């Protein structure tokens, strides 16, 4: 049974991952942290082992690692695709420098370390249909650039020092509990809110821009599964994973068929569209399926149904 | 015509390019800077147009760009392949943070900016025969990882801000003036010194390990040429360029022809061998040839004859 450290824990992924790990391994085995404190309505308010730590504070990060002695780390802090174009200084500081600290500490303290990549690591030369694990990487956002740097530097730590570095290229992740940072796939979460609130959604991704996507339960499954796998089962450090692909028009159809209500949607092309246009439509994740058993339980309608049930309960929005 | 700032100007490439730029444009149009001062023996010693600047100091870097007002920048400082593996914190700071300040200044101050990349950006999935401009980048050195970053970041500045960023992936560069900075191809330069001193060469690279190489004069030509080209002539931001490939054994023979005398090399793998073996054997530089006229005037024996003459003159070793 591992001791698990999660950084950037109050975000979209960390919120749910923190809870899944605690319930799988017990709360005493799981320490989580973030640059800020949870608000009183955050799902991690009031839980112990939830610390304040700025990962840009090298010394603090090392003090926490020293004191807790994790055997696993999920290093989740990142400024994301859309926000990063607006705050590229912040993107480069966090995505480069925290990642560099997390790797050195993994090396120094003998930690199996997970740092997520993303479909944003790809750009327009990747081969957008069923994009492979190994291809040309020409990301067109600074976030993507820092993510390729992350894959490569982590892979360098594995080969140079034997650090057990593992990663997946996350597709767009959909969840109910905590709202998304500043990403291009955020529209997909926002559309469910808009539908429950009965208010017009202004969508900055164009209606037929397909992206790889996944629902959180599947994502959690896979984030635990790749960290549990014996290193000998892994043929690579970085794996594509996908759930299913969809476009905004498709998601809208899904939501409408579950609510039996039309939703008002105005499509604009914000920065999210030009970014998302540079990304794959779909991924090939067969290496992940084959090496460690990546699997997806949810399709789009099962996800919409769960999201429509959970958001009212978790956020108080207009229910049934 | 241009005003040219060179940073990292006192190293192997910067020494000769600084001189060539001054010749071409007038000493008044060229400002060269480095974190150290030239030593008494240095080709740039006691010249005007030679400043002291540490490029990690972002305000200092900006101060000098504000005072000099370049239209062109050659940003050369980097920790290289072999020295990087030994001192990776140093390599990560310089190669990532100085590049970042330099791009940021090129944007703010409307500067056409060159930052070299390298064959070290490639790794063992690149396709090592006539390696292409677009391919898999899996560098096995932190130097290489930082250079992929450099490529992608400069290109993102181009795409996002309209920064005129240009780069070549340099092969191993050979010259006599200033001794090399701790790369995997330094054995070449050192084999010339061994021969002239009639001492035994300890070569850390294996005898038949082919690598792309180029002799300086050709290199100086291309670096000025890619910077002269009208932007509309450029189809990309990053170009492979090569001179000719050689292995240590071919270089031995070329020194031997030129000296009409046996020269004694002992092959004893150091860290350079694994690094070099992960690199290309040869590069396809047809895009560079076609877009802006990359061209190569020396072959191996012309380089050796020139090198065996200049090293005694410039370093005061025994002659012919
Ligand atoms: N959610 C998705 O759709 C998605 C998709 C692909 C990849 N990812 C990756 O997963 C990771 C988490 O993403 P997310 O969606 O949870 O992001 P998020 O923005 O929802 O949360 C990021 C968390 O990091 C914390 N943080 C920021 N700076 C920090 C610092 N200096 N020190 C400590 N904590 C800091 C933030 O406060 C926030 O709690 C990132 O690496 C992201 O790139 C997410
Ligand atoms: N020499 C080659 O064969 C070769 C091959 C491929 C790429 N390159 C690239 O060309 C560039 C120059 O290489 P080089 O061989 O001339 O390296 P070098 O080691 O000879 O010179 C580097 C110079 O950078 C200076 N420097 C270091 N830190 C600095 C800082 N903070 N601020 C200002 N200056 C600093 C050093 O004083 C040194 O003079 C590098 O980016 C290198 O990667 C060189
Ligand atoms: Na997001
Ligand atoms: Na060198």
């Amino acid at each position: 049974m591992p001791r698990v450290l999660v950084t950037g824990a109050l975000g979209q992924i960390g919120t749910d991952l923190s809870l899944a790990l605690r319930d799988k391994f017990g709360a005493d085995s799981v320490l989580v942290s973030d640059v800020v404190e949870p608000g009183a309505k955050h799902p991690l308010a009031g839980l112990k082992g939830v610390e304040k730590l700025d990962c840009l504070d090298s010394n603090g990060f090392e003090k926490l690692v020293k004191e807790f002695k994790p055997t696993w780390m999920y290093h989740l802090p990142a400024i994301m695709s859309v926000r990063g174009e607006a705050e590229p200084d912040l993107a480069m500081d966090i995505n480069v420098n925290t990642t560099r600290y997390a790797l050195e500490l993994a090396r120094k303290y003998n930690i199996r370390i997970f740092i997520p990549s993303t479909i944003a690591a790809f750009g327009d030369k990747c081969g957008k249909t069923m994009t492979k694990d190994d291809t040309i990487m020409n990301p067109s956002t600074v976030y993507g650039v820092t993510k390729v740097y992350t894959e490569l530097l982590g892979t360098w730590y594995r080969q140079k020092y034997g650090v057990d570095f593992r990663s997946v290229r996350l597709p767009g992740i959909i969840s109910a509990a905590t709202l998304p940072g500043g990403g291009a796939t955020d529209y997909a979460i926002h559309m469910y809110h808009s539908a429950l609130l009965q208010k017009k959604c202004v969508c900055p991704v164009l209606p037929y821009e397909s992206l790889p996507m996944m629902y959180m339960p599947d994502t959690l499954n896979s984030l635990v599964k790749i960290m549990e796998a014996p290193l000998e089962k892994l043929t690579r450090t970085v794996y594509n994973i996908t759930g299913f692909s969809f476009s905004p028009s498709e998601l809208r159809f899904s939501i409408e068929r579950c609510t039996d209500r039309t939703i008002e949607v105005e499509y604009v092309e914000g920065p999210a569209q030009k970014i998302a246009n540079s990304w794959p439509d779909s991924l090939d994740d067969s290496n992940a399926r084959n090496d460690w058993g990546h699997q997806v339980k949810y399709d789009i309608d099962m996800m919409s149904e769960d999201m429509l049930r959970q958001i009212p309960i978790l956020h108080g929005l207009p229910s049934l």
Side-chain angles (χ1 to χ4, degrees), chain A:
Chain A
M1 185 136 298
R3 300 162 65 75
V4 189
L5 168 58
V6 193
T7 61
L10 300 187
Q12 195 196 336
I13 298 195
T15 295
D16 285 320
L17 177 69
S18 292
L19 294 167
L21 293 168
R22 287 167 68 97
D23 85 51
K24 177 149 215 189
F25 297 128
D28 280 347
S29 300
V30 178
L31 171 54
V32 315
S33 63
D34 203 287
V35 71
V36 294
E37 306 186 69
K41 291 196 160 156
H42 191 285
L44 306 185
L47 306 184
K48 85 190 291 195
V50 176
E51 301 298 314
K52 212 198 196 210
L53 166 71
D54 184 336
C55 289
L56 284 174
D57 173 22
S58 201
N59 262 93
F61 193 176
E62 170 159 28
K63 181 173 190 281
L64 186 46
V65 165
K66 231 153 90 144
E67 295 174 349
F68 179 63
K69 305 188 235 300
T71 63
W72 292 12
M73 178 177 185
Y74 290 92
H75 181 73
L76 305 185
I79 303 312
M80 281 188 81
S81 23
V82 172
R83 168 139 93 126
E85 292 309 92
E87 293 174 283
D89 60 314
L90 200 70
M92 300 181 267
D93 300 341
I94 302 291
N95 312 352
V96 168
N97 294 336
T98 75
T99 288
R100 155 167 188 204
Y101 306 151
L103 285 172
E104 185 48 45
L105 293 173
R107 191 196 64 69
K108 196 161 178 203
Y109 293 97
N110 192 29
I111 315 166
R112 178 175 297 170
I113 180 171
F114 179 91
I115 318 188
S117 191
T118 163
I119 61 172
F122 297 118
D124 74 0
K125 286 170 179 171
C126 71
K128 296 201 209 159
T129 307
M130 294 298 283
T131 314
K132 291 106 65 229
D133 277 314
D134 290 331
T135 184
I136 295 160
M137 306 300 267
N138 74 308
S140 56
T141 57
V142 63
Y143 166 67
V145 169
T146 63
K147 288 304 202 193
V148 170
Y149 181 81
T150 301
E151 297 182 5
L152 292 177
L153 189 66
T155 298
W156 177 74
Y157 271 82
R158 163 72 176 81
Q159 335 255 67
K160 173 63 165 169
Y161 296 117
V163 173
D164 190 348
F165 165 77
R166 308 177 180 200
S167 188
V168 306
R169 296 198 185 101
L170 289 171
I173 308 299
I174 307 305
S175 63
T178 294
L179 296 162
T185 68
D186 293 19
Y187 84 82
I189 296 146
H190 301 330
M191 203 186 280
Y192 290 100
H193 286 251
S194 289
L196 293 154
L197 294 165
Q198 275 172 280
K199 282 273 88 96
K200 116 151 163 170
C201 175
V202 195
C203 182
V205 179
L206 288 185
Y208 326 118
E209 193 67 53
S210 247
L211 296 160
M213 293 272 194
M214 200 178 302
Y215 197 41
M216 186 61 84
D218 293 326
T219 306
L220 299 171
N221 193 65
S222 278
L223 294 174
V224 176
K225 205 163 185 189
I226 192 178
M227 288 285 279
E228 289 187 316
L231 177 58
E232 285 177 346
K233 268 296 208 278
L234 308 177
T235 59
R236 39 206 307 121
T237 56
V238 182
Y239 286 87
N240 294 344
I241 64 176
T242 197
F244 33 95
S245 273
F246 65 78
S247 70
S249 61
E250 293 163 337
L251 181 60
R252 182 197 203 172
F253 289 144
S254 173
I255 298 177
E256 280 171 3
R257 104 183 12 102
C258 293
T259 59
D260 193 48
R261 180 95 217 294
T262 294
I263 65 187
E264 326 157 52
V265 183
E266 184 193 1
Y267 291 105
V268 302
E269 43 167 329
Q273 171 49 211
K274 189 187 258 52
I275 290 172
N277 201 65
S278 67
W279 297 349
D281 298 340
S282 53
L283 306 181
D284 186 329
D285 67 349
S286 56
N287 288 318
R289 295 169 192 277
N290 290 337
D291 284 5
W292 48 274
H294 170 67
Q295 52 179 20
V296 176
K297 145 173 191 172
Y298 282 77
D299 68 16
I300 196 175
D301 294 311
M302 299 159 70
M303 161 182 85
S304 298
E305 189 202 309
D306 201 67
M307 284 278 289
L308 289 167
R309 286 191 57 112
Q310 299 227 215
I311 287 171
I313 296 159
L314 287 177
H315 291 252
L317 307 217
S319 49
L320 71 136

